[PDB]
């Protein structure tokens, strides 16, 4: 049993017709202090999987190393490591989910919420969540922390059910994700303007975008707001 110290906030994601999108801001908070401003919380595994992690950063760095070692170990005595016997998103997720549930069962959890996003061998989209309790679920849209409360409602307007996935393009899905990240910047006190975004498409592969910023923000209406009720000046 511990408590989280340096933390990362929401990770948001969704499926679209040909793949998945995942995003997360670059902040490492120390309570209310916005201590670290250059933290990457999206971690690619091969060219077909991206793991997005929220929660304790020291535990995130531990998981990052487990995945790096997983790739190394998979290549051992494996001539087809870059082909048929490469790591799949479902393999990577189940490994993490096994680890997360074992750690909670020893009462020494990895204080994280993880979303594994990727595309399988057969072109199928993979998107599944796992947390410190070992709880797992899948949905067309997934989000951690505040994203669950604010992002999912917006992303579910685009993909409300499974039949909406083929109708959703990558341009529409990215637009929705970027809008959700703006909303989180307005309303999440432990968020940052700077974020990273990753797209895993079955045709165009893995596109990893860094140093993105929230833009087109509405603040002008603040000038008219005066006092807390009766004040006019």
């Amino acid at each position: 049993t511990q408590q989280p110290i340096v933390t990362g906030t929401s990770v948001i994601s969704m499926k679209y017709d040909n793949g998945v999108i995942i995003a997360a801001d670059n902040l490492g908070s120390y309570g209310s202090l916005l201590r670290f401003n250059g933290v990457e919380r999206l971690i690619p595994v091969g060219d077909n999987t991206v793991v997005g992690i929220s929660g304790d950063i020291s535990d995130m760095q531990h998981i990052e190393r487990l995945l790096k070692d997983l790739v190394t170990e998979n290549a051992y005595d494996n001539p087809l490591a870059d082909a048929e016997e490469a790591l799949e998103p479902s393999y990577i997720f189940e490994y993490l989910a096994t680890v997360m549930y074992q750690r909670r069962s020893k009462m020494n959890p990895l204080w994280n919420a993880i979303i594994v996003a990727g595309v399988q061998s057969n072109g199928d989209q993979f998107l599944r969540y796992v947390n410190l309790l070992g709880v797992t679920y899948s949905s067309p849209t997934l989000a951690t922390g505040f994203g669950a409360h604010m992002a999912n409602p917006l992303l579910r307007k685009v993909v409300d059910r499974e039949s909406d996935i083929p109708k959703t393009t990558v341009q529409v899905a990215e637009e929705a994700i970027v809008n959700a990240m703006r909303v989180l910047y307005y309303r999440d006190a432990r968020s940052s303007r700077n974020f990273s975004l990753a797209i895993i498409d079955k045709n165009t592969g893995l596109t990893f975008k860094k140093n993105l910023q929230v833009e087109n923000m509405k603040w002008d209406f603040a000038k008219d707001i005066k006092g807390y009720g009766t004040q006019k000046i």
């Binding site: 048929e84 479902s90 189940e94 490994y95």
Partner: protein
């Protein structure tokens, strides 16, 4: 001679006699044949009885839905090794949601057998195994020796008089590899192969044991009247 008392002793010519003696137990064992195409993999095994009142010792063991082996030599040692394979196949599924690659299964068997050849007190395994399976890279056939050596092959045979079946497969190489999408013809080639190792006795209904795995075919074993079709 003086260097065969245990597995921890090299001979002056660099030989391990206890391992060689374990290899001898395989040669005494009943014949079993393995062969594959691009779509399917087949095991054919001649079962042996104690006498006319006795049953015919089972030769083939299932390890997973997509993998299994046939044995020749000490049957209990095959039970230990097959049990290990079952666990490893199962660990791969439960932890990684991943079917165990046949090549990796061979590497695990090699490493398990090796530990018994370098340590004092223990002994080498006294059994040879033919592992067949279908994974993400298609059909596979492996030959396991208790020295630790594992070999991926198109076809092979182990046991008494196994040289006859092995020569046949070496001639038929170009034919049986092309038998794709036809399980019955691949088994026929296996039954015809194991027939080259028979003397005096012939293939009867409770004598013959066949197993198959493939693209849309789980590892299944055929015994009794289920193999009368191929006699």
């Amino acid at each position: 001679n003086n260097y065969d008392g245990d597995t921890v002793t090299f001979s002056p010519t660099g030989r391990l006699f206890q391992v060689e003696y374990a290899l001898e137990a395989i040669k005494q064992g009943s014949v079993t044949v393995g062969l594959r195409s691009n779509t399917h993999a087949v095991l054919v095994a001649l079962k042996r009885n104690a006498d006319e009142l006795s049953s015919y010792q089972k030769k083939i063991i299932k390890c997973d839905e997509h993998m299994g082996l046939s044995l020749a030599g000490l049957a209990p040692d095959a039970r230990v090794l097959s049990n290990y394979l079952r666990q490893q196949c199962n660990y791969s599924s439960l932890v990684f949601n991943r079917k165990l690659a046949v090549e990796r299964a061979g590497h695990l068997l090699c490493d398990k057998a090796q530990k018994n050849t370098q340590s004092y007190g223990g002994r080498p395994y006294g059994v040879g195994l033919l592992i067949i399976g279908y994974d993400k890279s298609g059909a596979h056939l492996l030959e396991f020796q208790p020295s630790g050596n594992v070999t991926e092959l198109y076809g092979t045979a182990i046991g008494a008089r196994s040289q006859g079946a092995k020569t046949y497969l070496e001639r038929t190489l170009d034919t049986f590899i092309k038998i794709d999408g036809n399980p019955d013809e691949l088994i026929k080639a296996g039954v015809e192969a194991i027939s080259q190792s028979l003397r005096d006795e012939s293939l009867t209904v409770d004598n013959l044991s066949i197993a198959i795995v493939g693209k849309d075919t789980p590892f299944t074993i055929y015994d009794g009247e289920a193999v009368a079709k191929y006699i």
